[model samples]
Target chain A: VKPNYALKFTLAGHTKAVSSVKFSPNGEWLASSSADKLIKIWGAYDGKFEKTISGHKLGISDVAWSSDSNLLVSASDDKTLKIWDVSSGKCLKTLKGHSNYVFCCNFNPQSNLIVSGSFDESVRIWDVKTGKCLKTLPAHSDPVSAVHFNRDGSLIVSSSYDGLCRIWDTASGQCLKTLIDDDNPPVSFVKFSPNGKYILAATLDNTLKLWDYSKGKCLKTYTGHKNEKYCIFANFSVTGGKWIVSGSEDNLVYIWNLQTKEIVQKLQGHTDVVISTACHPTENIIASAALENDKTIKLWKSDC
Target chain B: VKPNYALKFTLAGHTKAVSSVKFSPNGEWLASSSADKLIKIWGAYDGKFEKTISGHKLGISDVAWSSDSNLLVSASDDKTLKIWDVSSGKCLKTLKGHSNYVFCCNFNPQSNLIVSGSFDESVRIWDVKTGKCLKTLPAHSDPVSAVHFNRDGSLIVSSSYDGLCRIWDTASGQCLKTLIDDDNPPVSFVKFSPNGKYILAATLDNTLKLWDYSKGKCLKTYTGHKNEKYCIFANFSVTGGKWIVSGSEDNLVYIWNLQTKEIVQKLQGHTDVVISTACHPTENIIASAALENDKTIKLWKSDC
Candidate 1:
């Protein structure tokens, strides 16, 4: 039997709409980045307040955690990236090079490298320890919307408003592969599966596709949630990777069976568009963030 | 072979000496209180900074996390206890009733009640959700140094510099029993065992004793870590409760086998008096905090 999740608690503190929500790798902490120029961390299981990280000069676009969950990197509209120590609540370094608002960021498994996509139509890699820009790639024809590192840290994935998803070699900054659907819709967000065998991309065509990136073949297509406008995110469930979860501009959270490609559950809560969803790493929990009208993050617990 | 623990990293950030360090019940986050009027949360595994909770006007004396690891209550020299939401990094409530410095605080298992010991020689219980003091008992003839709630939240345990350790009924605020070493030395800290069958008390006589609380009998006495001057703390290891860990004025952390009473390991690092030590909930990890001359917290991991 598949597990069913229901709302456990609604967490409210951020003064502005939340942009992204993520659970730390260890499954103990949850982080939410908001348009208010603040990032907040909470207990993943209880949804209790932990701490707020505030130093970004402008609204943060994205936030990522080091593999060990010790460090955090945030991309902001201020045209800068900042690295933070999660424990000391202090800013460790400010990365300056991006000429436009940064859109998305992610840390490699080794915790030494960071990859970020920006509005300047570029993707840049940085040394986590030195805060130095190691390489910059003119990654897309249009503004890059999302970027992520694969499980092993050897490759990276970037999606763009140019209607394409490209995989890059981490060491050489070489574009290794390119993927696009037949409809030619802009890809808003993309992530590599836990096993690194597939790529999941959210496109403006109101669909999500699972691609066998190595072979450049679409394995499955999931359709149900509305995503025609915003950069709504979708993710693979962290447990057995059996579920694909996503946010909908229709003001709900969606979960689909990955193998069956059938919509399994729909969660209704946010009064506005649900822009982001994060699944707990080792638990049956889900956190969803909303747009301006809601300004809340809701926690849901699954009953198997 | 017994597991041996060694230093993995030393974290330095607090501007003043750290007085206490604790690992959250979930083992994901670590909180440290300092004389600098701040409490900081960090990633336990990587020892990376999280955020600083700073609002107290005076030095902070102790910090405790709710069982769910959602809320945190801190005791301060400012004579107040502040309840914090761990996720939002916002102060939910500031408890103000004590006439003197608040030394120690703990939350009940249900997370609805708080018990605190203060320099005013009183032990008080407060409604956590309301930030209202529910009851106050003239608990000690001298300053109360440590207070804790038993595993079930039915009983409270407190130690005082008046050379006595007292157990109280949580609902009634009635003293159930008093424990005193034959030497009549002031007890510095006290904790109940995980099984709730025994009590551990640290005294200024340079000794720690495990007491069968119901029978009022000393089961074992541990020595070797100097504690004649400071209110050094000792705790049962979180893994299996098989080891007793403590801080010493000799600038080292001491670990003793619970059953054999033999000193099993001596961690050498802190350059000043070690006042607090916390064990990871599910891992072979330990965190220790030191006084002024050190102003650092060291993380140790066991090679089992």
Candidate 2:
């Protein structure tokens, strides 16, 4: 049967390819990281322009929302992570310990800290309030592409060009587990399941891997989507964990049923590559950002 | 870890608990069926009150939208299914056949026919234009709880308190598949994926089962929401079929991960049991209604 996917709306504001997109914790706003060095925010509910942050010296490599919905942390090719106040569009703080291009940033779930991965092959945990470098873990042997904290803020998961996912103890900065799928092909993004029992990571090998942290085993591998470039984003259904959502170099977003390892639906809209996918905090609506000439983000909704 | 879910909006209108809600295929409108025997339409994207649909002599049981976006099909305790002309809020046709309360109703994807389940232990198909019963199948040994059509309109799935779900060929009115596991419970609601490959059915066993019906495999069972007495709702997110949304006896709505069978979110706020839940057609919004103590429908959204 033909998939019932349809185009919703395209958000066009970024002058260059959108590297990352995120809905705030409250689902009130969406921020997109751009190679143009300007981050654009859109009203999450109404899809209206909100504000743009313009402080980065080079491409904004990645972006993440604080769990409390008040701040946004962005990674930049300029070698820094900048924290911005969501409401005023003000740059709140800038941490500079990465020593090289910062590729990914995430706000700790507690909203008190920021964890970032850099091309320097390390994970840096910083104090949100003081903008101080609290701990730096030389994480991957190659550039770290993605870093995320579990919902409880206790564990950190980082994936790198080394084709491995490392689990860490937040306080000790200790690498607790090194997740390597035998078929690992340079993971680009990683996320802990909301339940904290599993991990969903993307590969340049054109697939997604689900890992059981407790058993330290690979649960399943998902295919049928392209991610050969751009360090594409991935997600578990925001409302449930039944499916894995990811953007593809094929310019579509693929939804794969977790247990069946079957493609449930594919959303098509982007003309370039779809590099980022983010779920709203409270709604079933998921959004995606595009790369290069597309320079647009599409909101794929399912409520209707 | 607990899911990061928050109450987004609370819709206050109904004088009693809401029974069912559905979005129009176009995602521009939402039709809500309630105990008050009234179906109100709301702008799916804006959440604005649109219009009211009324004619049933008793409480409404369920509602479905014709694929064309021009009509609505609803079942009610009045022992009838009514088709409404959405543009004028006119009752186009009142289909009567069930000897008991009409429990569920839906339109085939092409809007060519209407499918209804009833307390009469039967499933009936009605011609959209003729208002005539097209076929009747002794669908269950007990009262039929829900019925749905696959994407191509070639198949129909109906469930019963008899712990059985049957898939039938629509043209020949022949049972093609009977999905009943040794551990199956009294089925409550049923839905087919947009791609026509999977099924999500809720049973009194207190769980929603995601099944690869083509393979007759129960892919996963989702939990965390209380599915007590009433036939609460369960559906895939509109565009991607990522998350599963359902109302619960827990006075909260729950979203399950489609893959992991884990609760991705527990949306709490309704003062009483959330009898019905609905998602937006094209946005990250959810609407839910409460039981006795609260006569309001809450609209949920997020910026994230």
Candidate 3:
């Protein structure tokens, strides 16, 4: 299934570059985390600005929503993560264990635990309610780029600038599998497929490869966008996982038919490097954010 | 609101003593674990037997349904726990690390993790996907009778025959609080309230008490049920936490108004000790199972 893409609205608010954009699991709000050390919530349906959340001491790296969408967690250059009450717009807890900048964070399916990766080359599992760092693992030789929990939250997948992607058992903190391309390009972004059977890694080689992480083999490679210099993010479309959507350094968003491995659409609007893209939890809507040069967030919709 | 409960149906299938009964979260199936070394599934709406799941080497002690209702896990006298696919009746994995009989088990809200208590006086968390023992804590001085994850799956409450109920952080396996009755009666069963604010514990002193587990203080005591002899399970009503329901050694099921602390209803039917009772996930239905003298499962419904 492919969607006919159309530009919906443009949001220009961040004083600095927008680093990440995500839709709440409830699909009620869209969160834009930025280098301005702030996160702004907008109406997911209409792109109307709602609230501005500010507490990070430095630039924000990424933001993730709890499964219920009532709470949000954000990573930052301040080497900490802040858990926020989305409705109250207050910081509930500040998790402080990372020795360096925190790049990515995600709440488990139960919303009780969080997994985070940092520039300290460690991945940490945290008790969300108590703001306790439960476990930390030396994950990579270089700065970690991204970390995410599997569908049920039993496993975590972490990617790093060391050209490696490793899957860890959430409970035991044991490395169960590792995926690395033979060409040895730094993996800047990685995520589990919707079915949790595969891992998609976006390398600095300007390509994304879907790997059967369990068998340690790459199954398919998706290409056509620039990703050589800065970290770029991508994810499976929420509309039944029929497509792959990603941001590119070429100043555009890219969507590919997952099964056919063909570019179906190139969203052209941003004037600078598109660093992140988010698919709506249950709709044919996409949100993309650009780097410091653009300092804007854009919403796109498709007729399914 | 008081519900007018009426006896719905009786199911006679287990040849041995019924040990535990539970309703799936989806409200589609009722599972009864028995000393017959089997777990039987029945249609929750009626008393029709669906299938028999048998794999444990010894009698089963407890069974828990995953939040999704697609999987079931059971603790057994065989010193292991087994995960089964509810629809196919197939044993997918056997969790084998307990040194003694596994008495109680529960799936976390996310369903990827399971906590189990055993005769070895330990509490173990298992990765459901790999059947690997993730963490094992020396939890009790005596055989543990029950273990449960809180609503968010971050905290675990465990009761033991050692006369203590302890709450622990699930991720760190660190004991947060320990509750013991003034008379130091052995705690037979324990569960977190629906809101996760309190814990209800059934003690051998012929009473049940609600504890503000965070403060380590008892808030209310519920009496009128004979619980001095065996492990009796009790839980908040599914109707809205307005009532409490439990089995009694007096061969009856008791319901107490949560706020008033008064016995609102006493259901009489079993010929022997009513060992377990399960509240329907989202309805005014209840399932109660008895020991060998009765060897039957009875269903009750109420007009809301």
Question: Which fraction of the native contacts appears in each prediction?
Answer: 0.00, 0.00, 0.00
- Encode model 1's per-residue lDDT on A176-287: one tens digit a residue: 9988889779999999998999999999978999999989899999998899998987888857448999999899899999999999889987888999999888888899
**CA RMSD of all predictions:** 11.4, 19.3, 24.1
- TM-score winner between candidates 1 and 3: 1
Tens digits of lDDT, candidate 1, B11-82? 555768889998899989999999999888877875555677888999998999998999999999899999
The model with the greatest lDDT is 3
Scoring model 3 with DockQ, what do you get?
0.01
Could you tell which candidate, 1 or 2, scores higher by DockQ? Answer: 1
* Model 2, position B140: C-alpha lDDT score: 88
Worst 10 residues of 1 chain A by lDDT: A42-51
TM-score for candidate 1, residues paired by index:
0.53
The per-model DockQ list reads 0.02, 0.01, 0.01
Model 2 lDDT per residue over A1-304, tens place:
2133344444655668889989887778888889999988776654555567899899999988887888889999999889988788899888888889999888877888889999999999999989999998989999998889997999999999898899999989997899776765898889899899999888888878888976778889999888777688888874644667888888788987778888988886567788888877777778888777577766656752
Off by over 4 Å in 1: B1-304
lDDT of each: 0.88, 0.81, 0.89
Q: Worst 10-residue stretch by lDDT in candidate 3 chain B?
A: B42-51
Candidate 2 global lDDT: 0.81
Give the interface RMSD of candidate 3: 28.9
lDDT of 3 by residue, B232-285 (tens): 889889675488899999999999898889898899878889999999988989
